[PDB]
Design an enzyme around this catalytic site. Structure first.
Site, PDB file in Angstrom:
ATOM      1  CG  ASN A 158     -86.422  31.046  -4.547  1.00 38.39           C
ATOM      2  OD1 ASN A 158     -87.553  30.838  -4.121  1.00 38.39           O
ATOM      3  ND2 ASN A 158     -85.358  31.069  -3.749  1.00 38.39           N
ATOM      4  CE  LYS A 175     -84.735  34.646  -2.643  1.00 38.06           C
ATOM      5  NZ  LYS A 175     -83.578  35.448  -2.130  1.00 38.06           N
ATOM      6  CG  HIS A 188     -82.502  29.520  -0.751  1.00 38.32           C
ATOM      7  ND1 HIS A 188     -82.270  30.640   0.018  1.00 38.32           N
ATOM      8  CD2 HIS A 188     -82.536  29.944  -2.037  1.00 38.32           C
ATOM      9  CE1 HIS A 188     -82.171  31.698  -0.769  1.00 38.32           C
ATOM     10  NE2 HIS A 188     -82.336  31.305  -2.016  1.00 38.32           N
ATOM     11  CD  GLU A 194     -83.686  33.810   1.211  1.00 36.30           C
ATOM     12  OE1 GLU A 194     -84.780  33.239   0.935  1.00 36.30           O
ATOM     13  OE2 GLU A 194     -83.236  34.762   0.530  1.00 36.30           O
ATOM     14  CD  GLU A 196     -78.710  30.548  -2.244  1.00 43.04           C
ATOM     15  OE1 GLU A 196     -78.743  29.478  -1.617  1.00 43.04           O
ATOM     16  OE2 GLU A 196     -79.201  31.579  -1.752  1.00 43.04           O
ATOM     17  N   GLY A 217     -79.750  39.044  -3.232  1.00 40.86           N
ATOM     18  CA  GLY A 217     -80.587  40.197  -2.917  1.00 40.86           C
ATOM     19  C   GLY A 217     -79.856  41.515  -2.707  1.00 40.86           C
ATOM     20  CB  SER A 225     -77.564  40.293  -7.892  1.00 46.22           C
ATOM     21  OG  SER A 225     -77.722  40.469  -6.489  1.00 46.22           O
TER      22      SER A 225
END
Lengths: 256, 258
Positions: free
Chosen positions: A9, A11, A99, A101, A171, A177, A217
């Site tokens: 991904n 992003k 996702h 986000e 996730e 991140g 991560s």
């Protein structure tokens, strides 16, 4: 058995000629022998898809690709939104739905994720349905139940054979991140629970075919422990997917 | 004066093959002489932009193009979102911000639109800043004031000189799917008020250079009356933009008069 999948991904990173350079870095860092043992996909921004499609098709690369979102609708008066029909015409194999986000910044609830997953399947795309709980849920010790409820909501309306056509990505939000990877045991606990639920939503036979990825991560020092877990079938990789050599290394490890 | 601008918002329509076909049909259909009198742009889905770039650059086309949205951020952990940096590298001239469909379906508020407009300008893009009142407001007769407040909010944070680098589009949302019809005079009333506000937010001189488009229903039968109005400088066109011949006709009418 399930063939492992390593999906990158990207992003909101990389313009269209940076995209071509990254794909070429991957395709020349990863020995051909690995593709028989791992599926490898890149997931660029929408604006990079034509460039990546023409490189992958024109050079007959064994890498596949996908997109980061799609509309729940097929066409029409939805200024700014991208249809699964456009993604399918561009040869996308995957599309990410739900996702964290998007759930957080763009008001996407389970019902919208489920509608997007159904629309992805209508267009012959494999949706990567993302779920994952927040730190407080984890702290309360309620991670398994929360994930199961989110899974049920995000797959609502899909029939058994449609479930058999999706990929799930776990996730944990605390891991995205942050440099805080789930222990391999943490990943396995949730992924095993996901597959058990998939067996109820579809059938045991179908659930044993569904790929369930870890995200959060992933790097060269932890990917091996994670993908070695019985119920973990690969990785949805964020930051490490932007470096072609690092990403290729992840794929080689997952191939075993 | 101000050169008219006909910008075709394709919305969520046309795959990359259909995009190439449409751009080639527009180029075939619109005589070259018209470009000296009207600017013409197409606004495809994100996934069609590279295809359109390579045609426009390779065929040396005089039409320009843009995108339908952008992130307020330049890069990062925003899965699914598209950066103005990417749009600039694809040779986009324009980007639509605050379209009524994004305000309705995606919750976009004036402050977010203003941030998107600023990010567009940071990347050298001309934002087409969309505003427009809904039926209840129009029925109250408070519509000019509502539009002026939405304009002020959607341009907040921009300096006077920056306002000279934007395009505004008025969408009569009250006449979009309600059975109501907006006249050329209705467009003029709002667009004149828009320009007066731009003069306050910037200066009279700057305001006189800013292109203000009509973004209601635009077709061959009504485009001439709309662009004839003193303060209306063209159209942000919906469905007619998907037909190359019809779109070319709109441009020709906007160019040739009356």
């Amino acid at each position: 058995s399930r063939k492992p999948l390593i999906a990158g991904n990207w992003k909101m990173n990389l313009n269209h000629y940076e995209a071509i350079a990254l794909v070429q870095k991957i395709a020349f860092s990863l020995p051909d022998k690995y593709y028989d043992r791992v599926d490898v996909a890149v997931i660029p921004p929408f604006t990079d898809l034509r460039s990546v499609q023409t490189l992958v098709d024109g050079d007959k690369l064994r890498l596949t690709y996908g997109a980061q979102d799609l509309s729940p609708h097929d066409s029409g008066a939805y200024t700014g939104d991208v249809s699964g029909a456009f993604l399918a015409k561009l040869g996308c194999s995957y599309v990410v739905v739900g996702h964290s986000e998007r759930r957080t910044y763009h008001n996407e609830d389970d019902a919208l994720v489920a509608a997007k997953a159904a629309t992805a399947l209508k267009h012959g795309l494999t949706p990567i349905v993302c779920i994952g709980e927040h730190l407080d849920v984890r702290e309360a010790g309620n991670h398994v139940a929360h994930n199961i409820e989110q899974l049920r909501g995000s797959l609502a309306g899909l029939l058994a054979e449609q479930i058999g056509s999706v990929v799930i990505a776990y996730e944990p939000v605390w891991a995205i991140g942050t440099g805080r990877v789930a222990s391999a045991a943490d990943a396995q606990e949730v992924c095993a629970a996901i597959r058990k639920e998939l067996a109820s939503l579809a059938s045991p036979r179908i659930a044993d075919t569904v790929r369930v990825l870890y995200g959060g991560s992933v790097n060269a020092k932890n990917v091996g422990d994670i993908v070695a877990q019985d119920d973990v079938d690969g990785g949805l990789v964020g930051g490490a997917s932007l470096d072609g050599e690092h990403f290729a290394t992840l794929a080689a490890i997952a191939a075993g």
